[PDB]
Each structure stands twice: as structure tokens, then as C-alpha cells.
Symmetry: C3
Subunit: 286 residues, 3 copies
């Protein structure tokens, strides 16, 4: 049976997705998650919410315990994780107030625990080399886009639609993220180099969250909230929080509809393949 | 009033900038600085100098306590930091013996403490997300450039001048650095990749020093010394003589830059520096 | 005079290279190596082999003690290190089953000890800034290439041969590697970005091994084994552990043949000046002295 975990980032401290049924404080083999987990239901579908940066946003991106957050949701029997991520746009048609259902990323983070497996005592025994060519669960990506359509939110696909058909605010049907380590924002030089590489948005939290989700055998998809233009075009904290304020109502609608849409389908084969993928990536056993 | 801290890179392990008035062996919340801080004056202007690599150049770039160095200067009441940074050139017009007053960078460092704030036990409490689009203090950059002019050094600005102004040796009035972790120098493949990205010089020490200075509310500017062509493109005695001549020039730039800083009002700039820190605290 | 160390990667967790003469259980000032080191002879040349990931391949690329592996081989008197490195191809002409005698790299690793020297108690006292423009030992590179020829394996030299002269499987006489930190494989986005930078292969273990060998005054060369296309070529078999191990199975005998012949070729030459130069480069790179 399906159970959807939700990891909320900047601006999503009041998800208001369901009346809470229960509240749970857990530990994992990798430490404590960012905060208490809040439990409830969307229809018949069990749902669990946690704030990535903890209540009060005291934890910076580089210090978030991504391993504990993902493993805590796995241990509650989540089959899916939906994530929100505030980001800066590197592209003219990705405008503050738009959303992006990411399908690609380039990793520029460092110093974070990015795998559950290793040779040290605070990791699980083994060597896990996971395929990441298409790093998200494509089924769950498409459910996020379909949820946007079902809630009458514009969807823009730059492959099949002229730029003049891009009506803001819109959900972009694809996009690539560069994940930088933070906590500072990029220089103009860095922003132009990321733009020249063809990346669409920049953010501090996607990785290693997406990677650990796949290690945990979970279907993961992110909805990126464009809160600013990165400085190739000026981003600051107050600018980001103000835009997320204007966009959070849509984030809620999409996530709410997405959970219901997940629950309406059979995931048996996908889940079995998620699990089999973890086992076939163990080099120490092969 | 103003007080200018100076962080001396390679070639400045024992700077003879001013008569030593006092010395300060301090400890910061983030550990010990690279060495004792030397206090004095340039005319009327208070000044503090420390060698980034310590006496004897025993501390490699990745192990320099950038947080302690910057915070120690802040605790002494510095309003500005001037820094020197030896570098390799990535471009044909940047020649050994030239200098660069950097205005941009691309960060390839890792494993260094690059922020004063966090939830970790060895940081101050808070989440600080600093804007860094133009990461230096532009007033202080122009002062280093003017100091070079005042000491009869050629200044070349490829935005406002044609190539005829690029007469060596010259101070390049803008430039972008890639900061690598070291300690090894780049491969030819790495050098060509950085060149293709349009970067001007490569160095090991600019970041996180520039980042932490802005976190500390301080105006910061770097004068980079071109010591070599990086290996995209040489007896040691000639290299050392040329570096020696470059150090004389940089010493003159720094002393003149301190006097230039002391001659202007910085009230509003300093208030803006501090306000940028406060408005960058997301946890508040 | 000469003694050749060998660091075996994937496919070499049990090297099986020569008759075991001595088994060394050692420690270094930087900790324990990945496994015991096996000493013996290839023909008349002394040789030492160790598995980079240890016997069970329980040590991931990010956690290998590169410093201890290299220093341990130095302490046993090695003058040379030959390394194998499994990799994915970023280029149409580098096909699974080919090998690459690397001559360049771009480093995207982090969090690994990459130098013997520093100011902390677990390093040697000093500051070493090594030049790395051409980061391999060129004589030892050419010996790997000659060893392929002596064993009737195709050699492809893009500088002197046309694209239609590339016959697979072949040893490529040059190539650039991007070293990523792992353990995950690259995304499609990352793979196309590395390809656009002109890199030839992607791998997780070359760096800092190559850098520390030069710091130790040793001649180092890597033979990269193309086990997959990296995921830019989606119309091919997508990279995974199982595919890598399967291709390595089909290639390992030829890798051993090149290694064993290269060891013999190294012993057949004089290295007095090259070793003196390796050592002098270390001393002239000390910036505390
Ligand atoms: C509160 S502003 C910083 C937070 O917003 C995100 N963010 C928004 N815009 C950007 C940007 N232009 N670059 C990087 N991260 C950004 C980051 O992931 C971070 O957690
Ligand atoms: C004492 S030599 C090492 C110093 O040289 C500087 N440097 C000079 N040239 C280069 C270069 N081409 N690449 C990197 N760093 C360099 C680095 O910042 C380092 O502190
Ligand atoms: C078992 S597959 C992963 C191992 O082989 C190497 N390898 C093979 N293919 C790749 C690839 N496409 N990218 C990165 N490393 C690879 C890595 O260095 C690692 O030790």
C-alpha cells in the first residue's frame, strides 16, 4: 500500500495539507531527522510531513541530516517522497512564481553525507553504486504535472510549445538544477557559468536528498518553486521569502492532488523495481 | 573612524609595512589565527597585519583558519581588509609581473570552514545567506587601483580601454579568479577547462576569505600577483627576482591604499555592510 | 634498483598476478592500507600488488586510504606504481572493452586526503605544491602502450591514425579522465556536461592516487578499462554494477597480460635519472623550506 512522505523546504512551514492525526519523534541509524514528523491522511492515503530545515529554519542546507530525514520516512513505510525546493532561475522564461518539475541535476555540493552505505561505523555495511542517469521517479514526476493540470495551473513544455505560449505563472514540465553547497548565493561569474552549461535553476537542497531517496528504494519527485532570478540578471533572503508567500497556495494544491493521484494507482511493480535496483547496485555482494 | 587589516599571502611572511607599535596574540571563537597580529599606523590610520600562511609558510591553503583570521581582524575593530594572493594566469594578456584587482570568482574549494554561522557546534547560531553577485567591496577595489596609479604603476581596464593600454607590468582593473583547493597545481586539462570558462587567474586562497569578510561586515579587496602562466601555456632565480619586484610594488600599493582609505568617510558604507549581514539572517 | 607496485581496482580484488613470495601486513604514518600487500617476482623484476578496495570490495572510492596505499608501496621500495581503473566512456570511439592509457585528468573529488604534507599531526610537516601539468610518468605511460603492442593488442593513436583506423578492442594511446567522488553514477546532465568539456572517460578512483604517487617520488601510470558507456549514450546498455563486472570479466586476462609485460619492460631499462628527477621535484616543491 502507498504512503506519501512530504519534505517541505523554505516557505513551507505551514503546509496545511491535512488535519494532523498524530505526531511522531523518531531516531534513525543516521541520527535524528530535522524535526517531529506530522502524520495524517489525504482521503484514504497515509501522509507524513517533515520540515527540511526544522521548525524556525535553524538548519542550513549543508547541515541538514538528509540521511536521517529520508530513512525516517522509509521506516514509517513511505513508498513515495514529494519535495519542495526554493530556487533561483538561470533562464529568461523561468520567472519568479513559476514552478519546475525537475528531471535532471548537476551536483556541486560537498561535505554532506550522501550515501547510507560505506566502510565506517556510522554507515550501513556495503558499497552501493546506484544508477542516476534519470535521477527521479518518472511516474511520480508525471503525477506532479498531471496534478497541476487537474488544478487548472498552466503547464509549459518548451519542447512542444512556443515561448509565446508560456503564460505565467506556469509549471515547467522539465528542468535541470545545479545544487550548490551554500550558504552563500552564487557570484555573477558562477551564475553565468551555470547558465552557459545549460542549467535551468540553482538551489541548495535537492542533493543528496534525491540520491538517498533512490538508495532507500523510494519513488522521489521534486517541485521547485522559482523564487528569484539568480544574479545573472538581486536575490536575497527577503526576496525569496516574499515570493514563496505568493506561491505557497499553489504548492499546497499540487501536493494535495498529487497524493490522491498516487493513491489511485497500483505501484506494486514500481516498488519491487525500486527495491531490486538497490540490491543489484551492491558491488560487495556481486 | 577606520582601521585597515591586511592579510599578506605568499611573499609577505614578514611584511615591513610600518614600524611595529604592538603585537596581539589572540584566540577567536573559531580557533587561533595563522600568527600573531602586528599593530601599527600608516600616518594617522590604524593598521593590522597578519601572514595568511604564518611565519615560515607552514600552513597550506586548505588548512588556513580563514574564519579565525577574518574574525580576529573584526574583533580588533577593523573596518576593511586588504589581501594579497599569488596566482597563475589563464589568459594571454595576464603576464607574470602583472597584478589583478579581482572583482569576480568561481569557487572550486571544499573542506574549508566557509561560514561563521550554522547549527553545528563549532559555528555561531544562525542561518546566514549572503548575497555574493559582486562579492568584493567596490569602493575598496577602486582604492587599490588608485593606489597603483599614485605609485606610477600602469592600470589597464579592458572594459573602458583598448588593448593599447595593456602595457606590462600593469594592474588589471578587473578579473575573475578560480579558487582551487590545492595543494597541487592544476593539470593542463583543468587549466584549459578553466580558460574555456573565461576565468582570468587561478589561485588557492581567495575563497572563503572574501566570503567571510562580507559575513563579518567588513569591506574587502584583493590584489592578486601574477606569478606564472598556468600550464595551459623558466629558471627559478629569474622567477624569484621577478616575484621580489612584484612584492615591492604590492607593498607600495598597500601602504598607499591604507592612507587612501583613511582619507574618506565610510559611515554609510559600514552601516550598509552591517545591515547586509542582519538582513541575510533567515533564522531571524 | 626498480620494483613495481600495482594497485588493482574493480576486477582486481584478488589480483592473481604472480606467485606469492611474501605477504606484508603493514601500517603507515597515515593509517592501514586497503589490504595486505603481496610481494613476488614477475620474471626477474620485484613486484608488489594490493587491491584498492580490499579483498571483499567493501571500501568505496571515497573512503580508500590512498595515502596509506601509496606510502606502503613506497616503504617496500617500489620505484613505480601501475594502476587499473574501471571507467565509463564519454566518447563514441571509446567502446566497452577498450583500454585507455590516461595522460590527463580533471578532479571533482572532495573529502579525501590528497597530500602527505601539512600542519596537522596526521601529516608530514611541510607544505608541498607539486606541478601537475602532465601528471603521469611519460616513460611509464609509453611502456604500458608498448606492452599492449608486444601482446598483440590493438593500439589506437588519435594523433597519427585516422578514425577509420580505430579497430576494437584497442588500447587508446592517450585520454583524459574526470574523477567524480561517487558512490553514485553520473546523471545524464552531468555526463553531457563532462562530454562538452572534452573529457574522455569518467571514473571514481584515479585521484588522489596519481597525485600522491608523484608526491612520494614514484613513477605512476594508469590503465583505464572501459566497462560501459556513461549514460550520455542512452541507446546503449545503461551503466550499472552488473554490466561493469561482466565487461571486466571479458577483459581482465588482457589487462593482466599488459601489466605483467609492462613490469618486465620497466625492469629492462635504466631509471637512475628519472628516479633522481622524481625525488628532486618533491624537494623543489617544498614551500616551507
Ligand atoms: C532563503 S533563501 C536560500 C534558500 O533558498 C534556496 N534558494 C533560493 N534561491 C536560490 C538561489 N538563487 N541560489 C541558491 N539557492 C537558492 C536555497 O535552496 C536556500 O535553502
Ligand atoms: C608558495 S606557492 C603556492 C601558492 O601559490 C599560489 N599560486 C601561484 N600560482 C598559482 C597557480 N598557477 N595555481 C594555483 N595557485 C597558485 C597559491 O595561492 C599558493 O598559496
Ligand atoms: C562497479 S562500477 C563503479 C566502479 O567502477 C568505476 N566506474 C565504472 N564505470 C563508471 C562510471 N560510468 N562512472 C564512474 N565510475 C565508474 C568506478 O571507479 C567504481 O570504482
Amino acid at each position: 500500500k502507498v504512503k506519501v512522505g512530504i519534505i517541505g523546504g523554505t516557505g513551507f512551514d505551514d503546509p496545511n495539507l491535512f488535519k494532523k492525526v498524530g505526531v511522531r519523534q523518531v531516531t534513525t541509524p543516521f541520527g535524528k531527522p530535522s524535526d517531529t514528523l506530522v502524520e495524517g491522511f489525504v482521503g484514504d492515503v497515509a501522509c507524513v510531513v517533515l520540515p527540511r530545515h526544522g521548525k524556525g529554519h535553524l538548519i542550513p542546507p549543508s547541515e541538514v541530516n538528509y540521511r536521517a530525514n529520508v530513512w525516517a520516512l522509509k521506516d514509517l513505510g513511505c513508498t513515495h517522497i514529494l519535495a519542495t525546493n526554493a530556487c533561483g532561475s538561470l533562464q529568461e522564461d523561468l520567472v519568479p512564481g513559476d514552478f519546475v518539475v525537475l528531471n535532471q541535476f548537476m551536483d556541486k555540493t560537498w561535505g554532506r553525507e550522501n550515501t547510507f552505505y560505506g566502510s565506517k561505523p556510522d554507515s550501513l555495511k556495503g558499497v552501493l553504486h546506484m544508477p542516476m542517469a534519470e535521477p527521479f521517479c518518472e511516474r511520480t514526476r508525471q503525477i506532479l504535472i498531471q496534478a497541476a493540470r487537474n488544478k487548472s495551473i498552466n503547464v509549459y513544455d518548451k519542447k512542444t510549445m512556443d515561448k509565446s505560449a508560456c503564460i505565467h505563472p506556469c509549471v515547467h514540465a522539465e528542468g535541470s538544477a545545479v545544487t550548490i553547497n551554500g550558504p552563500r548565493f552564487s557570484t555573477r561569474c558562477e551564475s553565468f557559468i551555470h547558465k552557459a552549461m545549460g542549467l535551468d535553476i540553482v538551489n541548495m537542497t535537492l542533493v543528496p536528498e534525491v540520491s538517498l531517496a533512490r538508495e532507500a528504494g523510494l519513488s522521489y519527485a521534486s517541485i521547485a518553486i522559482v523564487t528569484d532570478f539568480d544574479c545573472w540578471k538581486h536575490v536575497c533572503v527577503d526576496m525569496v521569502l516574499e515570493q514563496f508567500r505568493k506561491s505557497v497556495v499553489h504548492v499546497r494544491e499540487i501536493l494535495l492532488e498529487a497524493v490522491a493521484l498516487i493513491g489511485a494507482e497500483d505501484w506494486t511493480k514500481t516498488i519491487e523495481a525500486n527495491k531490486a535496483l538497490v540490491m543489484s547496485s551492491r558491488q560487495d555482494l556481486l
